[PDB]
C-alpha cells in the first residue's frame, strides 16, 4: 500500500572507510595505435564502489586523467533483479571485464 | 404480390418469433443456413417464399421482419442462436435501456429516438414490396416495454398509412395472476390509446394454455418452448390461406371485413381443436364432427369466458388438410340445431368457412403428433365483457389510493390520461351490454 525507504549497512559504510585497491588494465582497441593504454583500477570497500583512472603518459600522445567517476556498475553477471557490482572477490590477474 | 411485413417489439415477442420462424423454415424446407438443397427453387424472389421470405439474387431466403428490443440481452441471445446467418443484421434493432414497465417511460423518454430507425427499415421494405397487404405486429399488454413504444410505432404507421390492415396478437394479462402491479396501469393506457387505430386485436392467455397442456397434451410441466410452439402453429394456420391453395379462399382483409360488427369492438378469440400427442393420434382418430364439438367445448378456448354466460355472434372456421364439404356443412347445421349454444338475432348467417387441402406440419422432437385434419376457430361473442369488468374494479382501487403515480409524474406525466382511460373503458363495456341486449 505505502512504500518505505530501504536499509543501509553502517558496518559496511563506516568500518572499512576509504579502503582502496589499485590494478593495471589492458584493452582491445579498434585502432591499431591503441595497444598499450595502460589504465588503472580503484576499488573502495565502502559500497563495493569502483572507479577507473588514466595516468598521463609522457610524450606518447593520449591525454590522461579520468574516464569515469566512482560508479555502482551493476555486474554483467548481475541480473536486473539481483544488483551485484562485480564483487572484488572475482578480480584476479587477467580477469574478464565488460563495463559500458 | 401477396406478402406481409413482420414486426416484433419486445421481451414479449422475441421467443414466439423465434419459434414461429423456426417452424416456417422447417415447413418450407429451408435449411437453417438459408439456401435450398439441389432442388431448383431459388429465383427472382417469386415462389412460395415470395409471401414471407425475400430470397434474392444471393440465394438466401431473407425473412421480411424487424425485431426491435429495448434490452440487448435477449436479442444478443437470438443472434447467438443458429439462424443468425438467416436473419438480416440491421433488421435486429437493439437498444441500451429498458422502458422499466412504465408506459410513459417507454412512450416518451426512450422511444422517440428509435422510431426514426424503425421507420427507415419499414420504408425500405415498402419500396421493394408491391402487394403490402399488411403487417403482423407482436407485443403484449403485461409487457414492461411492449406497451408504449408499440403504441408510438402504431400511431406513426397509422398516420402515414391508412390503406392497409393492422393485425395484432396479444398474450393478454392473466385475469387473476399479475406478475407486475404496473400491469393494470400500462395495460389500460395501451388499450385506450390503441382502440381508435387497431384493425384486429386478438388475445390469448398463458394460464388456459397451460390448462390445455396438462389436460390433453399430458404435460404437467410444459415450457415456453411448448407455449410459443403452439402460438406459432396458430399463426401458421392463419397464414396457410396465403401460402398454399385450396377450394374456397379467404384473406385477412376478408377477416376484418367479415368478423367485426361495428366500429370499436374488434377483439375476438381463437382456438385450435386437435391438440393431442403421439400415442393419442396413433391409436385414436380425429374427424370433422368431433373436431367441431371439441373446438366448441367451453373449456377448450384459451380464455376463461363461459359461452353460456355470453352469446355468440360471429364464427370463422379454417379447416386445413383433407376434408369433404358434406360433413363440414352437415356438422355446422347440427350445431345450429344445438340447444346449449346461443346466437343473437343479428347473425342468422355467421359461419365463414375456409378450406385448405394441405395438411398441417409437425416439428421434430416436439409434442404435437401427425395431423390429418386441423382447424383454426375464430369466434366473436359478448362474453369477454367480464374480463374488462375485472380490470376496472381492479384499477379503481389503485386510483382511489393514487398508488405508484409518482414514478410517472416524476418522469413527467399528468392526470389527464389516467382519468380519461377509465371512461374510455366504461364506454367500451356499456357498448358491450348495449349490443348484447336486444
Amino acid at each position: 500500500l505505502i512504500p518505505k525507504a530501504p536499509r543501509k549497512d553502517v558496518v559496511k559504510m563506516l568500518m572499512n572507510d576509504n579502503k582502496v585497491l589499485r590494478y593495471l588494465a589492458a584493452l582491445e582497441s579498434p585502432i591499431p595505435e591503441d595497444k598499450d593504454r595502460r589504465f588503472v583500477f580503484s576499488y573502495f570497500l565502502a559500497t563495493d564502489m569502483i572507479s577507473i583512472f588514466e595516468p598521463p603518459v609522457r610524450n606518447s600522445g593520449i591525454i590522461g586523467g579520468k574516464f569515469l567517476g566512482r560508479t555502482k556498475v551493476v555486474k554483467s553477471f548481475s541480473p536486473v533483479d539481483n544488483p551485484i557490482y562485480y564483487s572484488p572477490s572475482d578480480f584476479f590477474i587477467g580477469a574478464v571485464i565488460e563495463v559500458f | 404480390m401477396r406478402e406481409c411485413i413482420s414486426i416484433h417489439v419486445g421481451q414479449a415477442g422475441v421467443q414466439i418469433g423465434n419459434a414461429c420462424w423456426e417452424l416456417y423454415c422447417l415447413e418450407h424446407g429451408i435449411q437453417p443456413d438459408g439456401q435450398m438443397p439441389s432442388d431448383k427453387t431459388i429465383g427472382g424472389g417469386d415462389d412460395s417464399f415470395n409471401t414471407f421470405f425475400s430470397e434474392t439474387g444471393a440465394g438466401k431466403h431473407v425473412p421480411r421482419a424487424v425485431f426491435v428490443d429495448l434490452e440487448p440481452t435477449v436479442v444478443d441471445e437470438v443472434r447467438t442462436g443458429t439462424y443468425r446467418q438467416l436473419f438480416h443484421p440491421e433488421q435486429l434493432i437493439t437498444g441500451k435501456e429498458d422502458a422499466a414497465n412504465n408506459y410513459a417511460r417507454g412512450h416518451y423518454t426512450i422511444g422517440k429516438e428509435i422510431v426514426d430507425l424503425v421507420l427507415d427499415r419499414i420504408r425500405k421494405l415498402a419500396d421493394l414490396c408491391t402487394g403490402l397487404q399488411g403487417f403482423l405486429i407482436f407485443h403484449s399488454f403485461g409487457g414492461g416495454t411492449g406497451s408504449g413504444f408499440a403504441s408510438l410505432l402504431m400511431e406513426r404507421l397509422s398516420v402515414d398509412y391508412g390503406k392497409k390492415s393492422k393485425l395484432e396478437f396479444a398474450i393478454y394479462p392473466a385475469p387473476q395472476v399479475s406478475t407486475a402491479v404496473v400491469e393494470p396501469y400500462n395495460s389500460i393506457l395501451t388499450t385506450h390509446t390503441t382502440l381508435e387505430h387497431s384493425d384486429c386485436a386478438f388475445m390469448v392467455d398463458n394460464e388456459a394454455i397451460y390448462d390445455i397442456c396438462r389436460r390433453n397434451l399430458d404435460i404437467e410441466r410444459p415450457t415456453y418452448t411448448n407455449l410459443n410452439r403452439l402460438i406459432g402453429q396458430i399463426v401458421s394456420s392463419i397464414t396457410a390461406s396465403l401460402r398454399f391453395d385450396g377450394a374456397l379462399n379467404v384473406d385477412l382483409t376478408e377477416f376484418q371485413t367479415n368478423l367485426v360488427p361495428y366500429p370499436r369492438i374488434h377483439f375476438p378469440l381463437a382456438t385450435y381443436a386437435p391438440v393431442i400427442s403421439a400415442e393419442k393420434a396413433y391409436h385414436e382418430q380425429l374427424s370433422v364432427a368431433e373436431i367441431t364439438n371439441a373446438c366448441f367445448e367451453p373449456a377448450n378456448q384459451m380464455v376463461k369466458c363461459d359461452p353460456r354466460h355470453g352469446k355468440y355472434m360471429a364464427c370463422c372456421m379454417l379447416y386445413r388438410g383433407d376434408v369433404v364439404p358434406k360433413d363440414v356443412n352437415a356438422a355446422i347445421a347440427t350445431i345450429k340445431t344445438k340447444r346449449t349454444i346461443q346466437f343473437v338475432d343479428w347473425c342468422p348467417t355467421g359461419f365463414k368457412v375456409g378450406i385448405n387441402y394441405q395438411p398441417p406440419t409437425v416439428v421434430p422432437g416436439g409434442d404435437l403428433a401427425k395431423v390429418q385434419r386441423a382447424v383454426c376457430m375464430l369466434s366473436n361473442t359478448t362474453a369477454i365483457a367480464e374480463a374488462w369488468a375485472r380490470l376496472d374494479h381492479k384499477f379503481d382501487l389503485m386510483y382511489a389510493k393514487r398508488a405508484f403515480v409518482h414514478w410517472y409524474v416524476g418522469e413527467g406525466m399528468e392526470e389527464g390520461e389516467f382519468s380519461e382511460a377509465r371512461e374510455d373503458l366504461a364506454a367500451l363495456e356499456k357498448d358491450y351490454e348495449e349490443v348484447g341486449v336486444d
Binding site: P3, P30, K66, F67, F100 | -
Partner: protein, 427 residues
C-alpha cells in the same frame, strides 16, 4: 537536409546535456562507445538530423559544451558518454563563475564568446542546412544566463533565418538559494524575449511534486528529474526523425502556435508516467490517455492554469493511432469546458500523430500549450525585484563590475509591458 546542433550552457546546461544525449543514444542503440549497433532501420536512416557519421560507424553528437569551471566539464566528461562527446568541442575558460550575471555578461564572456562563435560557425558550415539550434541553459543560474544572453544576441544577426529554440529553468518560487536570482532573472528576461522566438519554461518544484505524486519514490535525484526532462524534450524531437503522417517542423509549430510577435513562453506536459502498480493496473485507451494528458496535476511547468484559460494548445502522440479518437476527444474537450479556452480563436487546438512508438511502452504523447499562465510568475519576480531594489542592497558588487540602474528600470518596464499585454489580450 534539415538538422539540429545542440548547445549546453551553465552548470545545469551540463546537467541536462548529459542526460538528454544519453537518453537519445539509448533510444537509437548506439553503445556508450560509439560503435552503432543497427537495430532500428528508420533511425539508422534518419540519424543525420542530429549526428554526423564518422569512420567505422561512430557518430559525433554535434553538440557544444560551455562552462567556466573545468571541474564540472571534467565530471560530465567522466560521465558514461563523455567519450562520445568531443575533445574538439571542449572549449572552456579559466575564471570562477562568482554566480555573477554582471561579470558573465561583461567580463568573463568577453574572451570566450569569440572562440565559441568560431566553433559554432565551424559546425554550421560543416553541416548543410540547420533548422536552427536548441540551447539548454538557466535564467536564474548566473553564468548560464550571462553566456546565453550574449550568445543569442550575436547569433541573431549571425543568421536571421533559423530557429533559436531556448530551454530555461524557472527559479523555484519558494526558494532560489542564490538570493541575487531575481536580479539575474530581471536582467536576463529582457534580452531573452527580445532575441528569441520560442522559450520553454520549467520549474523544479513541480517536478518534485510529480515525484511525490506518481513516482512516489521518496528518494529522488536531480538525475531522475533530468531523466524526466530528457524524455520531455525527446517527445517534441521525435517528429522530424520519424515517418508517417505528422507535421514535424518546429516552424510549423511556431506558425500554428504563436499568435503575436512577442509571445514566446510555453509550458510542457507529458503522457503516461507509470506508477507503482499502474504498469499492470492501467489500460492504455485513448480516453484515459487524454484524461491524464489534459490534467492540472500532471502539468509541471509553473502553476495551475486553473486561474487562467488556454490561449492555444498543441499535442503530439507517439504510437499507432487513428484520427477519429483524437477528433472525438477534441469534440468532447471543447464541449465540456466551453469557457476554459479563449473565444479569441475558436478551435484553438493542433494535433500530430507520430507513427513510431517509444521502445518498451505502447502509447505516449507530448503536450505543449500557450496560456495566460506566466502572469503570476513574473508578478512574483516583480514584487521581489521591487522590494529588494527599493533599498538597493547587494549592489556595490555590480557597481564595481560596471553597472547602473537605468537598465534595471527599462527591464522592469518591458516586463510590466508583457504583463499588460497578456492581461489586455486575454482579459
Amino acid at each position: 537536409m534539415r538538422e539540429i546542433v545542440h548547445l549546453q550552457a551553465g552548470q545545469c546546461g551540463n546537467q541536462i546535456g548529459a542526460k538528454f544525449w544519453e537518453v537519445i543514444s539509448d533510444e537509437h542503440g548506439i553503445d556508450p562507445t560509439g560503435t552503432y549497433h543497427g537495430d532500428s532501420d528508420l533511425q539508422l536512416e534518419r540519424i543525420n538530423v542530429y549526428y554526423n557519421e564518422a569512420t567505422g560507424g561512430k557518430y559525433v553528437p554535434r553538440a557544444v559544451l560551455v562552462d567556466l569551471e573545468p571541474g564540472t566539464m571534467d565530471s560530465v566528461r567522466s560521465g558514461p558518454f563523455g567519450q562520445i562527446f568531443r575533445p574538439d568541442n571542449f572549449v572552456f575558460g579559466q575564471s570562477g563563475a562568482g554566480n555573477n550575471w554582471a561579470k558573465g555578461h561583461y567580463t568573463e564572456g568577453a574572451e570566450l564568446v569569440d572562440s565559441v562563435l568560431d566553433v559554432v560557425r565551424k559546425e554550421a558550415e560543416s553541416c548543410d542546412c540547420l533548422q536552427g539550434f536548441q540551447l539548454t541553459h538557466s535564467l536564474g543560474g548566473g553564468t548560464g544566463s550571462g553566456m546565453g544572453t550574449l550568445l543569442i544576441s550575436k547569433i541573431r544577426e549571425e543568421y536571421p533565418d533559423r530557429i533559436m529554440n531556448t530551454f530555461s529553468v524557472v527559479p523555484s518560487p519558494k526558494v532560489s538559494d542564490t538570493v541575487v536570482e531575481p536580479y539575474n532573472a530581471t536582467l536576463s528576461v529582457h534580452q531573452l524575449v527580445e532575441n528569441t522566438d520560442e522559450t520553454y519554461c520549467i520549474d523544479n518544484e513541480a517536478l518534485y511534486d510529480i515525484c511525490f505524486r506518481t513516482l512516489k519514490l521518496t528518494t529522488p535525484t536531480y538525475g531522475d528529474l533530468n531523466h524526466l526532462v530528457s524524455a520531455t524534450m525527446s517527445g517534441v524531437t521525435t517528429c522530424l526523425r520519424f515517418p508517417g503522417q505528422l507535421n514535424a517542423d518546429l516552424r510549423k509549430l511556431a506558425v500554428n502556435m504563436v499568435p503575436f510577435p512577442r509571445l514566446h513562453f510555453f509550458m510542457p506536459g507529458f503522457a503516461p508516467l507509470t506508477s507503482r502498480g499502474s504498469q499492470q493496473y492501467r489500460a492504455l485507451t485513448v480516453p484515459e490517455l487524454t484524461q491524464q494528458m489534459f490534467d492540472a496535476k500532471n502539468m509541471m511547468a509553473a502553476c495551475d492554469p486553473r486561474h487562467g484559460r488556454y490561449l492555444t494548445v498543441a499535442a503530439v502522440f507517439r504510437g499507432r493511432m487513428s484520427m477519429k479518437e483524437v477528433d472525438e476527444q477534441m469534440l468532447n474537450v471543447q464541449n465540456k469546458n466551453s469557457s476554459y479556452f479563449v473565444e479569441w480563436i475558436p478551435n484553438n487546438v493542433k494535433t500530430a500523430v507520430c507513427d513510431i512508438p517509444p521502445r518498451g511502452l505502447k502509447m505516449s504523447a507530448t503536450f505543449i500549450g500557450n496560456s495566460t499562465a506566466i502572469q503570476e510568475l513574473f508578478k512574483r519576480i516583480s514584487e521581489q525585484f521591487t522590494a529588494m531594489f527599493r533599498r538597493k542592497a547587494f549592489l556595490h558588487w555590480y557597481t564595481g563590475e560596471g553597472m547602473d540602474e537605468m537598465e534595471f528600470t527599462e527591464a522592469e518596464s518591458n516586463m510590466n509591458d508583457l504583463v499588460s499585454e497578456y492581461q489586455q489580450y486575454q482579459d
